């Protein structure tokens, strides 16, 4: 897992990419509860592919099962959002949840409180567009979220293995930007720019959990996603 070339690193991640799923959305009909069920059903079916995608990320297979479970239940919403942000990169002003589920800021107002999360997701998508993020850097950023979002909570010298894999993905990011014709100063700036995005993706996730834990008791969801919330 550690001796792969950076060119071999991007091909492994790009090959492990999950598919883009569709929703059971039908514009013969419009509810805030019905629109909530579509987002939850879509996220539940994507979690099944994400679990199989995570197992194909270099370094994730070598960890203990208890640590694999902990990294996913702490970063599953972050992976879903950065994927949504990526799919909506070239649809300015709208979020492409699915090829048939494309919503704008006005439709996020039907559900309460989600507008702040909606506009933050939009701001992140516009940020990826003005930076012209490449797919090779996207699969690297998504792999960073998986290995980093739950590493501080945790048997220690498996953590040292996690940091060694994170160090390699950083070199892979620097390797790609060095091939795109950027100076070392521009590489360090873009590297810093990309990792600062993850602080906001982390922020949107914590805001997503707090809203997902309000409709849970209010009963306005799947068994797998409810297990992620009860964690």
């Amino acid at each position: 897992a550690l001796s792969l070339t950076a060119d071999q690193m991007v091909s492994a991640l790009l090959d492990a990419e999950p598919p883009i799923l569709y929703s059971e959305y039908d514009p013969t009909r419009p509810s805030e509860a019905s629109m909530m069920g579509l987002l939850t059903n879509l996220a539940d079916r994507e979690l099944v592919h994400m679990i199989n995608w995570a197992k194909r990320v270099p370094g994730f297979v070598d960890l203990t099962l208890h640590d694999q479970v902990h990294l996913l239940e702490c970063a599953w919403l972050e992976i879903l959002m950065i994927g949504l942000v990526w799919r909506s990169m070239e649809h300015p002003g709208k979020l492409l949840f699915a090829p048939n589920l494309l919503l704008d800021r006005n439709q996020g107002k039907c559900v309460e409180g989600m507008v702040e999360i909606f506009d933050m997701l939009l701001a992140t998508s516009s940020r990826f567009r003005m930076m012209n993020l490449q797919g090779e850097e996207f699969v690297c950023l998504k792999s960073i979220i998986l290995l980093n979002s739950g590493v501080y909570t945790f048997s220690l010298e498996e953590k040292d293995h996690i940091h060694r894999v994170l160090d390699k993905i950083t070199d892979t990011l620097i390797h790609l930007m060095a091939k795109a014709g950027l100076t070392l100063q521009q590489q360090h700036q873009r590297l810093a720019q990309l990792l600062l995005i993850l602080s906001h993706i982390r922020h949107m996730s914590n805001k997503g959990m707090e809203h997902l834990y309000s409709m849970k008791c209010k009963n306005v969801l799947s068994d797998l996603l409810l297990e992620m919330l009860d964690a």
Partner: peptide, 9 residues
């Protein structure tokens, strides 16, 4: 625990 079952296939 569904997350445990889907990880060992």
């Amino acid at each position: 625990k569904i997350l445990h079952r889907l990880l060992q296939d």
